[PDB]
């Protein structure tokens, strides 16, 4: 039962804030966190949540939910704040997971939160992982071997040396998931170890574990809406919430890498003039724009970041404007520093990382994550026995 994400329409700005700033869903076994999302109605609706353990391939594991929880699932989100003193009225929902109802999440592994809306209907659903600490995933990006795909590829090599979990059948038990930045769609998963030189596995080859480099994320920071801040020129208020027009981006694949730093997708909801940035930020129709004259195919350029789960709904599809030969689309987005990127999609879900409209430069600063699933053949679920983060500011060729 490959239960997958479900993108909403009203709800926007769905994230997993932990320790303040947003994060990727990968969580520790007892680390607290939230699921801040925002409804675009003054309707103080009732959003009942759920949680489900899941397998490697996201088939819902057959554990009883009294086993991977202690508490309840379907109970409406108590805490929520309304958009205070803003043009786009919205209801900021929020729920900490070590809360009153589900007083903790007591099993590592995959999960899937559901935000079914007041009857049973799943509005949305995000995936996260609660990794336990028993291995020592020693990873490091490093340039590939094949000279052709070396200027725009980032091989990833590492080991798993645990002195806590003696692996039974490491070729068949220890499955691994590799994440490029925080994305779940481009994970390079289902990889068997090469060596197993002892109690420790070792993954070394350059066939499977090889991510496309991908250039750096673009951004824009409309701290104050009516400003003229970072590449948001011609901000115009017209009979609506504000409109933030962005400078026409240019395809960077046909160019050389230029050191251009980002925070790898994450946005920062924020404003000046605001006490609490969560309920006091203001949505604003931002008009994106892509000038890629070399790009000519039958695939669709979708906008993508961390604010929208790297999703590919039709409410992010760039649109060719023959009057200018320039893609363009409006996307309502909360204020603050926001990263994004133009990811082509095949037509349905196939991303086609190569031939991306931005580039694949091997030296871009990506932060790769590695999750080590594991399932003894007496256990009733796939644990997660340690993650190892290793980014590409250390491409040790």
């Amino acid at each position: 039962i490959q239960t997958e994400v479900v993108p909403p329409y009203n709800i926007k700005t769905v994230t997993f804030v932990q320790n303040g700033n947003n994060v990727v869903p990968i969580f520790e076994l007892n680390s607290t966190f939230e699921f801040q999302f925002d409804d675009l109605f003054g309707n103080e609706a009732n959003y009942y949540f759920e949680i489900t353990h899941c397998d490697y391939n996201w088939k819902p594991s057959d554990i009883p939910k009294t086993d991977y929880l202690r508490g309840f699932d379907g109970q409406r989100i108590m805490d929520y704040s309304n958009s205070f003193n803003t043009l786009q009225v919205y209801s900021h929902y929020r729920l900490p997971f070590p809360n009153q109802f589900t007083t903790q999440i007591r099993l590592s592994g995959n999960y899937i939160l559901k935000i079914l809306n007041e009857d049973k209907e799943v509005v949305l659903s995000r995936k996260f992982i609660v990794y336990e600490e028993h291995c020592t995933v020693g990873a490091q990006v490093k340039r590939t071997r094949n000279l052709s795909n070396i200027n725009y590829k980032q091989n990833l090599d590492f080991t798993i040396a645990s002195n806590d979990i003696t692996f039974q059948t490491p070729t068949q038990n220890v499955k691994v998931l590799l994440l490029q930045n925080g994305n779940f769609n481009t994970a390079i998963k289902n990889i068997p170890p090469q060596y197993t030189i002892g109690n420790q596995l070792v993954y070394k080859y350059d066939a499977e574990t090889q991510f496309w480099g991908g250039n750096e994320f673009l951004y824009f920071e409309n701290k104050d809406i009516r400003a003229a801040n970072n590449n948001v020129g011609r901000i115009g208020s017209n009979n609506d919430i504000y409109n933030a027009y962005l400078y026409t981006n240019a395809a960077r694949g046909n160019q050389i890498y230029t050191n251009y730093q980002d925070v790898n997708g994450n946005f920062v909801v924020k404003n000046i003039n605001g006490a609490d940035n969560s309920i006091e930020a203001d949505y604003a129709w931002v008009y994106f724009t892509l000038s890629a004259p070399a790009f000519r195919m039958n695939k669709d350029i979708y906008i993508t970041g961390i604010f929208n789960n790297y999703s590919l709904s039709p409410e992010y599809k760039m649109d060719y404007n023959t009057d200018k030969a320039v893609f363009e689309k409006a996307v309502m987005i909360k204020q603050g520093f926001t990263n994004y990127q133009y990811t082509v999609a095949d037509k349905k879900g196939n991303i086609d990382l190569e031939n991306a409209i931005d580039g694949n430069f091997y030296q871009t600063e990506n932060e790769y994550t590695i999750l080590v699933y594991y399932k003894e053949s007496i256990d009733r679920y796939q644990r997660v026995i340690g993650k190892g983060n290793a980014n590409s500011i250390n491409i040790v060729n």
Partner: peptide, 12 residues
């Protein structure tokens, strides 16, 4: 064709 537009804000 020097197509460049300076922007920004200042408050005191």
């Amino acid at each position: 064709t020097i197509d460049v537009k300076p922007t920004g804000s200042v408050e005191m």
